[model samples]
Target chain A: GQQSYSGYSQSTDTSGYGQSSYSSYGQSQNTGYGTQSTPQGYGSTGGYGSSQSSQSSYGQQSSYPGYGQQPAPSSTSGSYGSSSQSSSYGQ
Target chain B: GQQSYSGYSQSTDTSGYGQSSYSSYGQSQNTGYGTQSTPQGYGSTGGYGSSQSSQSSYGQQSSYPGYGQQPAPSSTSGSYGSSSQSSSYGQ
Candidate 1:
């Protein structure tokens, strides 16, 4: 007897941001940024096969089932916040 | 705001079978065989990015969510049977 099998899988994600500010004296600026990422993995198993037979009233036979596959996952997260202030002097 | 994204996916599957039999005078042989296969799909979204900022009380912001991927399937089955007869005068 001969048996075989195979399978696979995958995934992905991304994010981004931007900000800027300017003032002459009493000025306040706030900035916030966030990012996230996640990656996935895949797999495969087995290949092909052969057969069998049984004779007369009292004969014997055999068979088997096969499977193949796997998965992988990756993830990341980030956040940013900032405050800016200006002085009374010239720039 | 400045934003960018990218992604990908994949899948696979396979199977096989075989058999043999023989009989003499007044004898019978029976054989059975079966095989199956199923293939699947995958997907991905987003890549990388930039950012933005606010000066006073209120500011504007924007964002997006994306997805990609599909699936495929395959299957098969088989069987066999045999019967033999004999004559006293034949070799």
Candidate 2:
């Protein structure tokens, strides 16, 4: 039979009764802000999910062992009108 | 102080027992990011700062009372989407 292999990264620690190491990754076809329900890893206890952003405006949020959110960082629709004269990109 | 004039930013809410409103701001001499406890004005329990920044790519994180403290943080780069590999900005 033929075989193949792939590479990976994960939270590097596992020591205590009944524990296993865990790793996480994400995939997207097109790019846009991810929603808070999208589940970007956010692993269980004793582990943190690794976030990989293909684009920005909204990367990943937490690193808590059990913390995870896919907040839809509202797209900057060409400009940010925070103040009276504030423009695109919040600059 | 010179004519005792200077400026500030935070949170909203008031009075089951007590509360105060807040506002936050960003002040950069050369224009960069402010850091933790830059305390851009988020106020007390029940109230949240009105003034805030999506500007803090890593802008100030929390608001602790007695919280007023100066910071020396460099410009925390925004999740500024990507740009073509170039010699100009957004590289």
Candidate 3:
């Protein structure tokens, strides 16, 4: 069995100022067995306004699946002010 | 089996201008069996800059666990030029 999850995933953040603001879950899960799987709860970012971020998920079976079982992948989650900011997931 | 995955998650966004910028995976997963799970691949937000973001995950066995098997959660993924923003996943 193999399992991986994220709550607030991020990398190489520059210009530290309110860096990684309001971070949230990047990966969440509940499973038993499987192979080649991926789970993200709430990924994140840095600098400026980073508002709020959230993530969603659900699954049963997966194999060699590039992209499978996604609630909100990419398309902005909630809010973001001037420089960089806001709510639900990415943005 | 039950699995939840979110790439980008968020909640509540104010002011619009580049609303919900970037945006990544909100949920992602691959599993076999389980229940009551939440996975956020890459959560997000809104407004201005919203530079860059990334998500990561992987899984196999998860049960009644609120937070389990996490590779990268909240801490920023890639870049957030001004507001919000990147990637990888699992099992």
Candidate 4:
């Protein structure tokens, strides 16, 4: 009589194999302010006129004349001669 | 008589003739505000083990044996009997 026997053994185990996790958060923010202004001024005033006077004059003239004469001598001589001649003839 | 005369006269006047004027004004202004936010997430986790078992067996056998006999005496007895008978007859 004869007899024989054999055995083999192996093992594998797994638990909670694959897992994933996640998280979230938040924040607050703000921005600034701005302002501006501008201004300007006035301008000039200008000139005035001059006053003057003047005068001028030029030449002037005036004139006048008068005279008189006599003619008695000839008439007296002629009267004397005629009288003489007449006396001689008469004489 | 005669006479002559000449004259020249001039004058100039100005009032409130040339002027310039300017004026200006101003104002105020402002700007707005802003805000922002962000978020994110996280990653993974992994693996493990396994197990197994096996067995085997093989053949067996058994066995036995048998027997035998005999004799040769009968021939010797017959020969002795015959010889005795013959001797008696002869006597």
TM-score of each: 0.12, 0.14, 0.19, 0.09
TM-score of predicted chain B versus true chain B for each candidate: 0.18, 0.16, 0.17, 0.12
- Superposition TM-score, candidate 1 onto the true structure: 0.12
State which candidate has the highest lDDT: 3
True contacts kept of each: 0.02, 0.00, 0.14, 0.02
The ten-residue window of minimal lDDT in model 2 chain B covers: B1-10
Reference-based lDDT, each prediction: 0.21, 0.23, 0.32, 0.17
For candidate 2, the clash count comes to 20
Q: What is the interface RMSD of candidate 1, in Å?
A: 38.1
CAPRI classification of candidate 1:
incorrect
lDDT of 2: 0.23
Interface DockQ of candidate 2: 0.02
Best TM-score goes to which candidate?
Answer: 3
Candidate 4 segments exceeding 4 Å error: A1-32, A35-39, A42-91, B1-25, B33-91
C-alpha lDDT of residue A30 in model 2:
14
Worst 10 residues of 1 chain B by lDDT: B22-31
lDDT of 3 at A5: 46
